[PDB]
Amino acid sequence: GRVRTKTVKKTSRQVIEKYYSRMTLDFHTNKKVLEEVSILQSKRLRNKVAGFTTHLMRRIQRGPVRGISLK
Amino acid sequence: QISKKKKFVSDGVFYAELNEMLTRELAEDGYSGVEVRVTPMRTEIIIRATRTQNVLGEKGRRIRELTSVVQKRFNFLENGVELYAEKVVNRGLCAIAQAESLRYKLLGGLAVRRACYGVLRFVMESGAKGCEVIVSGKLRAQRAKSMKFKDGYMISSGQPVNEYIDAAVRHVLLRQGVLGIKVKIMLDWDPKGKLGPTTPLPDLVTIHPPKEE
Amino acid sequence: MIISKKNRNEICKYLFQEGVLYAKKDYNLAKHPQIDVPNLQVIKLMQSFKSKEYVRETFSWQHYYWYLTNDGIEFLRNFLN
Amino acid sequence: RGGGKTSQIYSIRQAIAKSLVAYYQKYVDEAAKKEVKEIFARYDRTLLVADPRRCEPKKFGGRGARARFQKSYR
Amino acid sequence: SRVCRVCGNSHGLIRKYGLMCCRQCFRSNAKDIGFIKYR
Amino acid sequence: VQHRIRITLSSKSVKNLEKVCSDLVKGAKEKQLKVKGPVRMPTKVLNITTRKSPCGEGTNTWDRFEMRVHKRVIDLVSSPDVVKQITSITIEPGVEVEVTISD
Amino acid sequence: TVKDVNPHEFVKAYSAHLKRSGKMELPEWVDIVKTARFKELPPSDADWYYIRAASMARKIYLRQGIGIGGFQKIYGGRQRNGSRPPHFCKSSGAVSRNILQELQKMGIIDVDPKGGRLITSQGRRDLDQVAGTVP
RNA sequence: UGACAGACUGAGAGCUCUUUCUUGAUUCUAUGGGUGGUGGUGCAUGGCCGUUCUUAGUUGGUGGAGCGAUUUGUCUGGUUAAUUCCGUUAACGAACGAGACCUCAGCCUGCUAACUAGCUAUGCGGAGCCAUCCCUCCGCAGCUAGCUUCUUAGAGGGACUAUGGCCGUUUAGGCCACGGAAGUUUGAGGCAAUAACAGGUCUGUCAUGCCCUUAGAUGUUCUGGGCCGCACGCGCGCUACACUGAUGUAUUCAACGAGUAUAUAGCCUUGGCCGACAGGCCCGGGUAAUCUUGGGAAAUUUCAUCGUGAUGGGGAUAGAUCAUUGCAAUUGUUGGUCUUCAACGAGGAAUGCCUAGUAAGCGCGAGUCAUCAGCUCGCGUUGACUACGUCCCUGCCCUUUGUACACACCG
Ligand SMILES: [Mg+2]
Ligand SMILES: [Mg+2]
Ligand SMILES: [Mg+2]
Ligand SMILES: [Mg+2]
Ligand SMILES: [Mg+2]
Ligand SMILES: [Mg+2]
Ligand SMILES: [Mg+2]
Ligand SMILES: [Mg+2]
Ligand SMILES: [Mg+2]
Ligand SMILES: [Mg+2]
Ligand SMILES: [Mg+2]
Ligand SMILES: [Mg+2]
Ligand SMILES: [Mg+2]
Ligand SMILES: [Mg+2]
Ligand SMILES: [Mg+2]
Ligand SMILES: [Mg+2]
Ligand SMILES: [Mg+2]
Ligand SMILES: [Mg+2]
Ligand SMILES: [Zn+2]
């Protein structure tokens, strides 16, 4: 039931693009980093987006990845 | 002495009787709403319209009429309450003004579809994220039918409906029936606050550009 | 409606002094606020002024708001002034 | 204060159990309460942590949280 | 001998808190008075 | 010289009322007054349930209207003019002030 | 004292105490009354009047400021109305008022300022002395 | 225009009449026009509401295909609660719905506090007692607090499937496990698309077209009666058919809400006294976290009595009387007291609701309200059995397929 929707998925890819090196594997630091690169309207949605940037960055740190274009 | 429950209801009912009284008269004036403020030693009734010279009458004759009968009716100390007439900063963003404009066109004898598209493009040209207009009644034929004119964006569910949609319903008494008018106008995110709301849509995001140093 | 000249005269005194007036739908209350009348004479002579368009009547959802109009001030001027 | 009869007995249970370890944490030893806690926890987990369970609100169309008025077709 | 302050209807009337509205005219004016339907 | 003056605040609005509440507190804290507040009072919740239909037909469906009412209290050890010298800032729309002289 | 002893077994002791603590007056309506509107039969026990006293001599001991309109509630209970649903029912005040009257005359309780009925200085003694006389 | 007595009439309605006063151009008479109508038509309408339909569905622009209706987009597949995603791809890029959102509940010995909330300490005061002090329970006040654990209400914090494991196009996601207040979107609700229905509502609305009537009224007002009537069939329910109980003691634990000058105390009503109950008289408190009320709720828990008996289960029916509400109690408003003691022995064919503080049990508050709650909307209290599935019955969504159906298989 926790399938991440388009907004969480799309923002998560897009937010990595603009700030890749600035991110990490920590969910809470990623939550805080995500706090000061955007303006959002709910903390539940923030954790969802930061949740889809944390492990996504393992699969990025592990191998290649789709539309997101890392310099 | 009166308690808090009876107090808050008393203020609320006063607003409704006032606002539903400011529609009987300022119908063909572009009345859009009323701000009932209560200052020390004075209580404000900030009427606001899209045609201010009409509500004032000549040299403030009509406003004299209005303040005094409000004075008398709702038992205020004389010289207590006042009425004021502001102008609406935008006309297209207020469905009350647009519904009444559309009503007066249909009453006068403008063709129905000429009126609805005229309203629709005005509201959009006024800066709205979207507009929606519904007319329902007997047009040219005894069986009733409903026409819907839509433009731009429009939401219908969730909490943000309350803080982004300005909607009005007005009856029209065209001969041989009643055509009801629904004007649903969608506002745009305006941080200044004067035209549109201040918070954005709940699922709108802005990823700030990554400045380089 | 049979209003006395006395009862008639007290209606329109208030009209000049203030300009506005307000009754309710409440029939035969026997004491109008702000004046002395059983509320039927006021209501049904406002209708006489409204029929002859000396008052502008916003029926105000059965709550009877009235504003005296220039057409009738001149005519009501020639009765008690 | 509050609750019923049974709920209070389950309450005093935690009050007694928790109050001991808080006293032990603050005044005896921090590792002399690790023994105490695992006595309480290996028996029942609800002598330290409450039940979040509460009275689900009533909704209309019936006189219960889930129960609905009996339905008749003819 | 108690009717709606809005329409003068004798049925479905709400004296609670001293509104004296019928159950329908109230619903028509509910948000204006300030009764928010939070739930 | 130094009295017991109580300011009572009620409103329908959480955010709006705490705008005024804190301003009064910071108003008088800039005067180093004895400001004992805010004492926060149980929120009253007026309620009406009405049938949604105008005709009593269909699945009987009910809407629960309600109103939150918030109750705030401030204590000032001050004078009847020091209370009014402070409480002259712009009172935000609708917020109810009813300062009285306590015992 | 009072709280270390069973609020039941103790009142048996204090019900045996107002028998043999000299004596007092006793209504010429005692043996007929049902003590409440909703009761079905009058109290079964013959020496119920002192048990009601002993049970209600601890009320003021363990509280303060109870009138008759509150003492009615303390002994009221459910009421079965036959066909219609059952409710709460408030018991009678003639019994409750008079128990107070007797213990007033005997120096266990007194009338209370600020309203109500308040325990005596020396009545507290015996309710604590006989309390000590319970296992 | 208004009236005396009597007739006439329930009527102290002057309604009409006897008679002769009284008001003074207000009116009355006819033509015409208005007005009112809980009168008709929801198959003339608006608005609102329900329902199709609680599911996941709907639609442009440009481009492609077809003479055209139409189609594609909107999908083979995996996944999801979801047209939600991964992807696919003659489509590309968008709009609604879904989600997000909003509200109460579940954690915060961290923050702002708080005598209209309240512990904690100390001063005294009462008692018990190895007793003099100490130990214990209690009541009253304060510059007692390096008071806010408990209560209120603001801020924000916290959960994101985050970490681990197996599964999987090793994608989206699935199952689990330590931790945690919390891992069905944590719980429950609010809002909620397109297209429709000849769905309901003209009896909510001086919302409303047309028609009917408009002074001997379908207008209004008053008296009285009816909506409640009883051979019978139906639906939601209350109380039971008892011992896992009835009664009578003793014992004592909530939460949500509520108190319109209510007139000379008055809505909620404490405390005193009278009274067997019912109910009175008295002093008062509160426009309320302040008084009612920290709402001393019931089931429950104890201790006896009953003993398989239509019994003391059960409480219909009815007789006598008393008290309260109201202008009025009759076709018993209701609450008492005594007496009367019915059917009912777990309910045939059928059939409803329901998956954890849930079902079921128990009581309380609010709406209506002068009085009446077997109702509805909320609240808390005790608190399970079962299942963790399927498409069998009843239905819903999508695809493929057949149709002689299109008011559409009730064809
Ligand atoms: Mg029962
Ligand atoms: Mg009629
Ligand atoms: Mg219809
Ligand atoms: Mg309709
Ligand atoms: Mg095309
Ligand atoms: Mg072509
Ligand atoms: Mg196309
Ligand atoms: Mg949900
Ligand atoms: Mg209607
Ligand atoms: Mg009926
Ligand atoms: Mg029902
Ligand atoms: Mg019995
Ligand atoms: Mg019992
Ligand atoms: Mg009731
Ligand atoms: Mg299932
Ligand atoms: Mg075939
Ligand atoms: Mg055919
Ligand atoms: Mg057939
Ligand atoms: Zn109404």
What does this structure look like?
The structure is cut from a larger assembly and holds seven protein chains of seven kinds. Chain A is globular. Chain A has three helices and one strand. Chain A has helices at residues 6-18, 27-35, 43-62; one strand at residues 38-39. In chain A, helix 2 (27-35) crosses helix 3. Chain B is 31% helix and 27% strand. In chain B, a hairpin with a 7-residue loop joins strand 4 and strand 5. The longest helix of chain B has 16 residues, at 4-19. Chain D is mostly helical. Chain D has helices at residues 6-27, 34-43. Chain D is rod-shaped. The relative contact order of chain D is 0.10. In chain E, 38% of the residues are buried. Chain E is 28% helix and 10% strand. Chain E has 39 residues and is an alpha+beta fold. Chain E has a two-stranded antiparallel ribbon with strand order 1-2. The termini of chain E are far apart. Chains B and E meet through helix 1 of B and helix 1 of E. The structure holds magnesium ion (18 copies) and zinc ion. Zinc ion binds next to strand 2 and helix 1 of chain E. The structure holds one RNA strand of 411 nucleotides. Chain E: Belongs to the universal ribosomal protein uS14 family. Chain E: One of its GO terms (molecular function) is structural constituent of ribosome. Chain E: This is 40S ribosomal protein S29.
The main sheet of chain B comes to: 4 strands, antiparallel
Strands ordered across the widest β-sheet of chain B? 5-4-7-6
Q: N-to-C terminal Cα separation of chain B, in Å? A: 67 Å
Number of strands of chain D: 0
Assembly context of the chains:
part of a larger assembly
Instruction: List all distinct small molecules, including ions and cofactors, that are bound in this structure.
Output: magnesium ion, zinc ion
Distance from first to last alpha carbon of chain D: 51 Å
**What is the ordering of alpha helices and beta strands of chain B?**
HEEHHEHHEEHEEE
